[PDB]
């Protein structure tokens, strides 16, 4: 998932 | 192309690792020629005092047996010499190099129509390098043990017979690839030594005071052996089952979790091999203990024809 | 300072790995960083609309793209600050499954990344027979936790760098380090 | 492979004979080792400050009687690296003059050991009237040469094991071996 | 008085002897070793009853089995020598064997067998017919091994040379200069009441075997191993029986001046090192008094120092030297 979330 | 840029400036203690690096790039790569004259120059640095220029010539000797394998009898007395180096970092580098060196050396020694005198002494040194590294299972350095376990994995694969269920890899070499017109060694003796090394790995895998790194490495080696040589599938599945039932009390809690995650990875790899047909239920049972779901396990089982299942089934009944 | 080739691996090679990369490089370590995801993912106006880019897209370009979409919004959520830091470290995020570089230590920042890294290196045939230690240090994916995690990873690599024989001591070193910090650090070995 | 009883003899039964004992055992030969000196000698520091011990001392005790001196400087010359190899093979170094075993071939490592072997067996009245070949293969008493010497000794014994009638062939085999290896190999016969 | 030890042993070797007819060659050798340990040691009274069970295995096709039978017969002549006339034919027959390994083993065993056999036969007061036939076969064994000096196998020749040395020593007269050996036996030790043979025919035979050894020692195409063995045998003969010292010293002098052209360089050094050791052994013997200068000269040629030679010479009081110096002058 996304970085950062 | 006359030996140009003769980079033999010998002054600098760390730059010897930079000259031996650039020398190797052309002498052993670009101009594959004239590698034979330069052998004794780089070889004399095996007696150097520094530990990193010795590891640099191990990378040289290993590249020698790749590009130009008939130099095996010349570049080999330093492999058995640097195996007894007093630096453990040098010993580990030699073991790593011995993986491809023993393979390339054996394929070259096998294709010889008339084994000469240098070929018989070259094979004799390998058989003793093999036996030396096998002794290093009981070495007190944990890094040496890890590397030795990985080396013994390749020997077992080399000195056994492939079959229809073997995982197909590009350069797989088995006992079926050594010919009958070879007098340096016999198929039956290599096969005998391969089984004895496997028996040593299987026993090592089951010891009660094994380190976590060695155990994970040994488990990875047994898995590679079994998927390459499904004749050993029954023994490896049984060793995995005994491990999962009796974890060594020397492992900490996070090492247990590390060992079990790796064991689950190897079990999944084995279940995908058609030679794991007989042991599919045992493998499932362990994967369930290690946290896989029913549907994750089910997806790993390879589809097989009903007549093929009927052949494998009845064959299992005949062997019983 | 100890000639150790270190890699820090996350999902997108955007937040957690670069924070650790930042601190490891300033301490003089031979460090690289990678992500294991299929594409680079960055947050945005909502959960449902993340900014997704292909691995290899320069940090400079991602900076300008986010700058054009909403420059004020991506300054107050810290993404332009993060992109600027990454821009100053290297050109673009790299995928771990594509690299041909070899390391002595690989550090992943969550168990999902650890599994991807292990499955990848096991899917390759061993050639050099060279072992690499794979360590998992859990780091939550936010700015504050990436910072604390980057301290833990840097401290861990520094302690391992001071060993005269890392292979012979790493298990005991991790054991004490774990106990001191009440963490679980998974640790296995893979081969190139 | 063959039913050849071989013995390798040196001065102390520590470095040269054990290096050959190790390699010959790995080749499957029925092999034993002995020394001819008065006591076991081990080198350390000054030229004529050597560690000396009785014959019949366990190899472990030398590893232990090393407790008082360093343990480092005998990691520098590989001396207890050498000592544990012997402990894995046998319990204590043995003196040739005291053994009652009989061999087909006795291999000595230097001319002075060769003379001590010959003098000892000629001093005993023969009973079985059974001959044994005594061969000399010069190997310098240092770590590097002891290893190359064991390769030559193993080569020599391997060549003789292939013969269907060693007594009828050994002179020609030694003659050819000397030519190929550019060495001199004394060869005599003694009687039990 | 009785006990159960004999009956328990007899049943254990009956099971072993019955097992032999069906055993593999490797199994027969283990069985035979167990049998010999009991029938010739633990319970030696079982010896005669089980001879044919073992002696029949002299015909087995495996050479290792035939060697084990040789070892058994050799032990019989050490511990139960009265059975000599019942085991001695197998020895003479096995000297016709096709296997050189078996021949060499039989020759080795004939060393102790001939010595034990000769000691036993010359001790009997009224020897029976079986004793005369045992001597006939020991005579044949001597002639059989003497002919193996010209055998084509180098190992057979080496063993034969060693056997012939023991015969010369047994069949000559010890004197006061003989080296002191505990079990030494000479023609002085066979009595006048012996009718199986005559002391002087044995001395004649011993003298002839020594001549054959001296002639063999000086041939031009002798192998290095045969030459070193022959040199050590001549040395043993001379130190045990110093009456032969002159001839042995002369043979050594001729060898050192004319080394066979068939020896390689390293064989020459091996031969000379061995000759040097034999000369040192002889110089320690008091019967080498007359020949000390000759021996010294050879030792100098072979690289001994003046002081290494001088230390070997035994101390003698002047009255003993005068007896020797005078005896040497009269015999001349």
TrEMBL record, chains C, D:
Protein EC: 3.1.3.16
GO process terms (BP): mRNA 3'-end processing; termination of RNA polymerase II transcription
Catalytic activity reported: O-phospho-L-threonyl-[protein] + H2O = L-threonyl-[protein] + phosphate; O-phospho-L-seryl-[protein] + H2O = L-seryl-[protein] + phosphate
GO CC annotation: mRNA cleavage and polyadenylation specificity factor complex; nucleus
Domain of life: Eukaryota
Keywords: Hydrolase, mRNA processing, Nucleus, Protein phosphatase
Record has Hydrolase as a keyword: yes
One protein family per Pfam: Ssu72
Keyword Hydrolase assigned: yes
Main location: nucleus
Cellular compartments annotated: Nucleus
GO MF term set: phosphatase activity; RNA polymerase II CTD heptapeptide repeat phosphatase activity
Stated role: Protein phosphatase that catalyzes the dephosphorylation of the C-terminal domain of RNA polymerase II. Plays a role in RNA processing and termination.
Family: Belongs to the SSU72 phosphatase family.
Name recorded for this polypeptide: RNA polymerase II subunit A C-terminal domain phosphatase SSU72
Source organism of this protein record: Drosophila melanogaster
Upper taxonomic lineage: Eukaryota, Metazoa, Ecdysozoa, Arthropoda, Hexapoda
Recorded name of the encoding gene: Ssu72
């Amino acid at each position: 998932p996304t970085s950062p979330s | 192309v006359v030996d140009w840029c003769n980079e033999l400036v010998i002054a600098s203690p760390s730059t010897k690792c930079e000259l031996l690096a650039k020398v190797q790039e052309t002498v052993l790569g670009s101009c594959a020629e004239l590698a034979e004259e330069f052998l004794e120059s780089v070889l004399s640095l095996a007696h150097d005092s520094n530990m990193e220029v010795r590891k640099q010539v191990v990378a040289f000797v290993e590249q020698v047996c790749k590009v130009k394998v008939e130099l095996l009898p010349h570049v080999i007395n330093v492999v058995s010499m640097l195996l007894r180096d007093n630096s453990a970092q040098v010993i580990k580098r030699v073991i790593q190099a011995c993986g491809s060196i023993y393979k390339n050396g054996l394929q070259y020694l096998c294709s010889l129509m008339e084994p000469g005198d240098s070929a018989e002494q070259a094979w004799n040194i390998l058989s003793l390098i093999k036996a030396q590294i096998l002794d290093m299972i009981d070495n007190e350095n944990d890094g040496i043990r890890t590397n030795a376990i990985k080396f013994l994995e390749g020997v077992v694969v080399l000195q056994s017979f492939a079959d229809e269920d073997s995982l197909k890899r590009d350069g797989d070499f088995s006992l079926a690839d050594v010919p009958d017109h070879c007098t340096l060694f016999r198929r039956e003796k290599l096969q005998e030594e391969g089984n004895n090394i496997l028996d040593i790995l299987l026993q090592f895998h089951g010891t009660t005071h094994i380190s976590s790194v060695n155990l994970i490495a040994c488990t990875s080696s047994l898995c590679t052996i079994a998927k390459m040589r499904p004749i050993f599938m029954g023994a490896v599945v049984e060793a995995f089952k005994q491990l999962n039932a009796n974890l060594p009390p020397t492992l900490t809690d996070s090492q247990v979790s590390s060992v079990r995650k790796s064991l689950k990875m190897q079990l999944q790899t084995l279940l995908k091999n058609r030679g794991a047909f007989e042991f599919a239920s045992t493998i499932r049972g362990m994967l369930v203990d290690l946290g896989s779901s029913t549907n994750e396990i089910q997806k790993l089982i390879p589809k097989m024809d009903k007549q093929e299942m009927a052949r494998r089934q009845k064959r299992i009944l005949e062997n019983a | 300072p100890s000639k150790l080739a270190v890699a820090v691996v996350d999902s997108s090679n955007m937040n957690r790995s670069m924070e650790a990369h930042n601190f490891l490089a300033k301490k003089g370590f031979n460090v690289r960083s990678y992500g294991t995801g299929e594409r680079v993912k960055l947050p945005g106006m909502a959960f449902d609309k993340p900014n997704v880019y292909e691995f290899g897209t320069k940090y400079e370009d991602i900076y300008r793209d986010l700058e054009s979409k909403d420059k004020e919004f991506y300054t107050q959520n810290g993404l332009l600050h993060m992109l600027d830091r990454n821009r100053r470290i290297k050109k673009c995020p790299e995928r771990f499954q594509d690299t041909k570089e070899q390391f002595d230590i690989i550090v992943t920042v969550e168990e999902r990344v650890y599994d991807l890294v292990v499955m990848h290196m096991e899917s390759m045939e061993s050639v050099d027979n060279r072992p690499v230690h794979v360590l998992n240090v859990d780091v939550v994916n936010n700015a504050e936790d990436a910072l604390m995690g980057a301290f833990v990873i840097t401290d861990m690599i520094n302690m391992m760098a001071k060993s005269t024989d890392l292979d012979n001591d790493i298990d005991e070193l991790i054991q004490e380090f774990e106990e001191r910090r009440k963490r679980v650090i998974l640790h296995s070995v893979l081969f190139y």
